[model samples]
Target: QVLRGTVTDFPGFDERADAETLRKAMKGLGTDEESILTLLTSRSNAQRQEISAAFKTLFGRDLLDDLKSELTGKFEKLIVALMKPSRLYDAYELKHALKGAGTNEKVLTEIIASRTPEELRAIKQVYEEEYGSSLEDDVVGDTSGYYQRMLVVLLQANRDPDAGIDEAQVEQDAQALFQAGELKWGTDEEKFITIFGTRSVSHLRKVFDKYMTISGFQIEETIDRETSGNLEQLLLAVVKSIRSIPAYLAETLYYAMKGAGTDDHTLIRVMVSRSEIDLFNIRKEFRKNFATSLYSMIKGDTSGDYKKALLLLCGEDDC
Candidate 1:
């Protein structure tokens, strides 16, 4: 398998690289932006701090500030956030940006996109520590409608699929789904959450296949019949992804930007947030499901500043 990026095991810099070497690295005369970008942006929260200390020892300045001056916009924000030694600090910045006078929806969206369940839990704790406020409450206050509700659900759900699969629950929930859709009045969302919320993507894929075999209908169709509005739609998307997430994400991106006016917020939020984590998976999913490249999809769907930002993040253009 092709791993997305390098993950440093150690924390802090080597003691051997003297001041002169550090200055040279910072000067960027022959420094590797690609390498640095990959490492700083892709490494876990702890790994970044190790690299930062190494950078400071060599360069005699704050690694984050230097990067901030060198970059801009969402890219700059993400890189800087990664450079923060503590994951809590990054969470603080996210909460600060969203809770203020003007909620930077872009920031909130990006944060949600990239964060793992563990990282989000840390962020939630940091948010409470820093603001004496719940991040969910702030999100609710800052946003509304489908988008707001989606973020809230994500925050509350905090589903960690990495904690091993629950096969018994999956079977029970699958049976419950059969009852709700095929033999009963409506869908049992409690059952859906019991399975969807807990299972790994790989496990979910198996459950979904079983669901289709047993029900003689696609999960999306059942969802369409049993629920309404954006929440239902979102659930349907999640469940359908047991078959193919990339296709679901691709279709999502296509629809998000397809209409009259560009949904710049969604475009930037999804790309920026997923770039470090799921964007590559989403790309693979898109290709596997649709037999089309994500780049081509974006190229055909968008134009101008919005397109430029997305493609740059995608590494599809010279930044």
Candidate 2:
């Protein structure tokens, strides 16, 4: 399947050759950091895995361990992130978010809201396999009320697939959402959760349209009025992801780069995680929505090899 990822498999590729190249880059007295970033950024995650294995077979040394020893600072951080299997990296990110003194709800919200059921299931399984704990239970310990409930519902990995839409059902949901939020004095949080959490994105798109007609307000507008704090953030993210995940993620990249002192963790996570997924689409959306290419954003906001690696992943902007 041709995903809209910026980091495709490098043309005329050979794992043994890549392994040799990487070894030579790091094997010398001074590490060839540019060669490592250039080579890794151009290859897809699966290809990177093969390269790592080949590195082991060729040198009888662990590729990641060697890289860890050589590279330092944010550049090292970005390179290490690139080496991880996408879902395993996600599991680790979630683990860090939850285990921290205060939960990084932003990380949890962004990741959990954006991933598909299959992806979520993979992350959940890996979270357990790696940590010997349940992701859902860990989330439960960290969060409360409607936000936690919605997170668990999504964590169950049971969102409806892109089945054919039911017009009648869409209308029911729209009306349901209207009653749950717009028509009532007090919002029915679970009603909003059940509909938003369980429905297919395609279904929700229609429901949101019908909801606008019924409530005389956009679904987002009602959500803004009805919910607050983490719950509101997650609901908005769900809606945004449903509309376009790439666009939502594009916005994330923009925010990460916009303010003073770059949000390096979010910047690295999104760049690495989406590099093999929809980063091409995300870059397109980034330019479309922000009127500035993500390429230039990174160029202006960051410096050094980390910027170089991110720009490579972002690809050159067509505009």
Candidate 3:
């Protein structure tokens, strides 16, 4: 079973040689950033892990350690991200976002909202095992009110299976949402949360469609009116994820590179995380929504090794 991944396994893969090449790049003065980026960017994540083990076994040096010392800034962050396992990477990102002075709620929303149930369960496990704290506990501690409640719901990782849609349930949920938000004076946030949190994406898609007829406002519009703060962001994320994750992520990538200054963290996260998952579909959606190629956007927004590495992961232009 496959969805779409832009980065694939490299032909003629040799972990020892890959490890030696990376060692040489970081061994001497000035650090060969280009060689490191060229080699690592082209290799699959699993292959990179093999290289890392080989590097440790042969030279008694950690690949991630050497890379961190040799590389600096966003480029370093991007490369280090590539070395970690996908779920581990996500777990670390969540930990970092939560542990800091102010919370990076966007990171939480994106990772939690986008991950599959199995993946989220793995992340929750990893978060506790690695950090010695419950992910749910941490989230509850950091956020407050309805936003926290919705996040807790998502954290359960109990979203319904992608089985056949329930036709009657769809209409019922739409009416439930309509009555909870638009048709009432005070919004019933839990009603919205319960439906958005537990329903399958395919099921929610139809319910969202039915909601437009029942409430005369798109689910997004109702969400805007009914919810505020992080709850709003998370609900919108669920809606976007339900509609089309590739489209949602395409919008994310576009915004990361859109304005005067780049959001390097977000840009790096999406590029590294999605490169092997659904980046191909994401690039296609990016072209359709933004009227320009992702390739061109990366070229325009970034520079040097950071830009080159991202471009490598991006594969090729939509054009």
Candidate 4:
């Protein structure tokens, strides 16, 4: 498989050089932004964590703290993201979304909706350890109605990795989804939510396929017409995520950069989270779905070391 990251694939390689390089670049006169980006953007997440650990042991100072002090703006955001463990990083980002003024429902939904069972469990553990409270409780406090229900369901982290194939079930689910929406007076939230929440992603893909076949309409379109509010928005995001994680995230990245001001948090979060996962696929989808390349977008919008780091992380067009 073609990995979408710029990792130095050297086996049994220690991070001593990388760590010491960071120490010298960061500890001395005038931030060596070029060297910093070159080092950070080139190493794998695992490599970066090793560097973080080695930095503290070698220098007797927190590497992340020093980097934060040296860098500012989006560049700092990207570096901070790279330095932490992925699970902890994701947990902190999730808590930020849920904890403050006007909960960013989009972020809450995005993080909760796209994560796998393993990933969710890690985030849940991190959230509890980091915040001194349960993620479930936090989400419950922050939301209500069907929207709350959706978040709560996924927070359980019980998504089946493999729901056995059933051609019969596919037909039935198609009919049920159809009746719940277009054939009925109104939308049946439970019916849609049940399939979305419980079925394995593979099974859900089959369900969505059969659903389209039966209803002669895309399932997403039905959700739009029949559902409304946060529930509706989250369901749409969930459906897209189940269908294709990269594509769902690609849409998010586009929206992050689309209008006047960029949604920096969203952009940074997606880039950092997906860098080693499937950013290459997301980049491909960005062009196909938006008719604009993500590479071009980032290169145009950002500048300085920040832009360089993002571009390197993006790994666009073999840059």
Candidate 5:
């Protein structure tokens, strides 16, 4: 199968040959950007990990370190992001966010909400391994109130994973939701929180549509008007994620490069994390939402090797 980033296992797949190609490409006079991109961007994450291990075994030089010395700026960042296991890379991003002086709720919420149950479990394991403490411990250390409750549950890897939608619950939920919020003088916070936090993705999608049909307003619109603080943030995130994670990530990617200067960390996190997931879909989602291509956004905002690396991951791998 074609990987989401449009990469796959290299045909005839010899890690040894790829390692040699990497060594020569990085060590030469003018670093071979084309050769570097061709080898790294065309292979799956597992395949790339194989090449990293083989490069060490054969030459005693870390291919990653070698590339780091030769490459500069965003290009270097891009290549480094490509060299690790996807889950470990995600753990690294999460750990960094938590360790900073203030917790980035947006970053924390995005990572926690977007992961599958399996991905959630694996990221917590990697977090323990990489940071020497539980992911739960740190989140608790940094957060409080309704936000903390959401984070704790999300970290449990316990969201219902069944693809089955409760067709019967749709109308019941729609009316319950309307009664809980717009139909009343006061918002029933628990009802909104319980359903958003517990229902399976398929079920939530139906709830959202039913909600609009019943109330004549998107749940998000009601959420924005009725709620404040962290509850609002997480509920909106949950809705966005349930509808389309790629679209959520697309908005994240746009924010990463918006305003004066850029959010390199957020930019890198979205590209590298989604490189193997639904970055392909994100590009399409971007065009739909923003009226511009993700490729052009990256190409316009970033320069040099970083731009090339990101453009490749965006499925414009003509590089």
Candidate 6:
């Protein structure tokens, strides 16, 4: 299937055109800016490297450096991060954010919350290839407590392999969820945590459907009644959005920055990380659900570096 918002070609960079051609392209005129942004932002690190090599051959300058000079703020940061040759660079940045003099909790939450199973898998693989160490090792050394545990679980990134329905397992898991949330002991935190944390999103979709069928209420409603705190709320959102991740991400973004001061890290991390994957969908969802574009909301909520980074990732100029 054709990837949504994918463009078939970018304007050819002519060495003959001097700086003018490059300047025009950067202006995002005529050419598919959205596709270019999507490709640059979303592709695997390996894929980006290949694209970068082609870009250098075509433009006679480093693509990353060019973008860096051309862009500013958090958007510049994200595009630059995307330009890195491997996932280890991303992990190193994460480590810096967490271990540096001042911890950036927003960054920690965004990284953990927005990563999909597949992206997390690619990140782990890249981390091992580049660092000669597992992501788990870094998490173990750098983090602690429920936060650490959550990060570790996120790193595992295991989801059911079979995207197909397993009716029997669905019913069993759904029933367990009901028992955990709606039935005895008032709450089965472990079960709720385990199923939501471990199940593949595809399988979880089926389970969620079964859950509503069996429980006579939505999973988020159940979680609201039984669980408390940000972590629990986040998990409940994850479970509810198994079938439609873009909506889930949009909701997550709304909550992350909606009240009080903005969660800068969460805002930057989610927008940067999800830009290539569900971002297009998230933008669509944000517009549909909020009656305003994600970019507009972000622009209103953040300023300076943070806002720039998010707007760049969202391909706002293209929009």
Per candidate, the number of residue pairs that clash is 2, 0, 0, 0, 1, 7
| Candidate 4 residue lDDT tens string, 1-319 | 6636434444665788888888888776688889988887887777888888888888788888898999988888888887777658778887888865589888898988988888898888889999999999988998888788878888887777785799998888877877776643136666667778887899989988998877788888855522467877888888899988889999999988987988888888898888877888888888889888888899878888888888888886522
Candidate with the greatest TM-score versus the true structure: 3
Q: Rank the candidates by TM-score, best first.
A: 3, 2, 4, 5, 6, 1
Clashes of 2: 0
- Distance from true position, residue 117, model 5, in Å? 1.5
Winner by lDDT: 2
**How much lDDT does each candidate structure score?**
0.57, 0.87, 0.87, 0.82, 0.79, 0.61
**lDDT of each residue in 1-319, candidate 2, tens digit only:** 3448888888898999999999999886888889999999988888999999999998999999998999899998999999998759889999899964589999999999999898999998899999999999899999887888999998987888899989899989988877776544146777878888998889999998998888787877755522468887888888888888999899988888886789999999999998878998898889999999998899999888888998898888659
Ranking of models by lDDT: 2, 3, 4, 5, 6, 1
**Residue range 1-319, candidate 1, lDDT tens digits:** 5424123333454423422333444475455444445444444556556656776775568767776675666455555544555546546656766755586654565455434467777788888888898888888887766556566655664564555666785676567666765633234445555555545666766667667787887666765523465445545656654555445555566556555765554565455444554566666665665666667767777664334444545554211
User: What is candidate 5's lDDT per residue for 88-146, written digit by digit as tens?
Assistant: 98788777778545777778888888877888888888889887999999988888876
TM-scores, all candidates, are 0.56, 0.92, 0.94, 0.90, 0.87, 0.65
Consecutive 10-residue window with the lowest summed lDDT within model 5: 183-192
Candidate 5 wrong stretches, greater than 4 Å? 1-3, 28-30, 161-168, 175-191, 223-228, 317-319
Give me the displacement of residue 121 in model 5, in angstroms: 1.8
Q: Please, what's the RMSD in Å of model 6?
A: 6.4
